[PDB]
Ligand SMILES: [Zn+2]
């Protein structure tokens with residue numbers, strides 16, 4: 540292959556932070572970079588190249604069955620390993636992320652058309668609310 | 673109901689940062705997330721769950737009426753309270769944000785196809801230009 | 806003109822970091838904001854304004870012809886001047902970036918299905934893979 544015409548969506552990206560530490564790129568910018576995924580747009584006429592690099596934030600997938608213990612690696616937040624276990628309490632999904640931080644977990648439940656999430660760690664409680672699309 | 677299937681768009685997020693500090697998440701990451709809105713995709717079959725979760729940069733709304741003060745809380749920037757007043761000067765919105773920073777305000781005007789915005793704080797001026805599409 | 810209705814997409818943004826320095830914005834937030842492009846949707850009629858400001862990550866453009874030296878201001882990364890050259894080698898675009906960092910450059914090619922990118926600085930490599938859409 541010698542022609543690249545099209546829009547290319549990135550699927551893998553290794554040692555990005557290593558490359559940037561080799562460029563002495565500062566730590567805040569690096570924490571930005573490692574959460575991004577790229578899609579480059581490339582048009583070629585002969586040896587002539589037009590390319591544009593585009594970003595958007597990385598997506599994060601947590602899969603589980605209720606009642607089955609599983610290892611979660613908490614990328615997207617604190618990058619810790621935890622034994623996550625999800626259970627029903629009424630119609631409220633309750634997960635406990637057993638591990639290094641005490642009293643760490645989250646509850647989730649639907650009321651009317653809205654989703655309700657409580658994320659807990661120690662003393663602290665974050666309360667989020669969602670609308671269905 | 674124990675059916676969580678669908679796409680759920682966040683609309684409220686209290687104490688995200690308390691939750692993140694309690695996980696000992698570094699300052700820069702705490703500043704990245706905090707500007708984000710979150711839409712969670714959930715595919716549930718009985719007790720089997722897949723969640724995909726996506727993040728976008730949070731929107732920032734300012735609505736005002738000219739010649740009447742209003743309360744700007746400068747999220748997306750410095751997180752300060754200011755009392756803003758937008759007056760006319762010919763066809764130029766001129767706004768002063770009384771508050772802590774002396775000589776803080778902005779100016780906004782249309783010149784043909786383009787919108788011009790000069791943001792001022794003390795000795796520093798930032799000039800932005802927007803094409804109408 | 807006194808009418809501002811429309812969606813306006815940013816095109817230029819000078820002294821943004823200076824304005825943010827005057828406002829005492831913490832370093833990480835500055836390093837985030839300076840990487841953004843903004844679109845303002847404005848709704849008017851009268852003196853009653855409704856503005857929604859939205860942000861996305863700024864694109865980063867690199868245009869060249871295979872063989873012609875060109876200066877790069879590595880804006881998306883370490884903010885450095887390099888003199889870049891891109892050559893064919895077989896079916897593989899081979900760019901070198903002469904400048905302050907030894908062994909800086911990248912290699913880019915397609916393997917039927919997918920696009921392959923390899924950035925090198927010093928002895929460090931970053932390896933990326935894109936699927937065509
Ligand atoms: Zn985005």
Ligand SMILES: [Zn+2]
Pocket residue numbers: 682683684685708709710
């Ligand atoms: Zn929100």
Ligand SMILES: [Zn+2]
Pocket residue numbers: 566567699700832833
């Ligand atoms: Zn920092």
Ligand SMILES: [Zn+2]
Pocket residue numbers: 571704837
């Ligand atoms: Zn960011």
Ligand SMILES: [Zn+2]
Pocket residue numbers: 571704729837
């Ligand atoms: Zn971001």
Ligand SMILES: [Zn+2]
Pocket residue numbers: 595596728729862
């Ligand atoms: Zn972002």
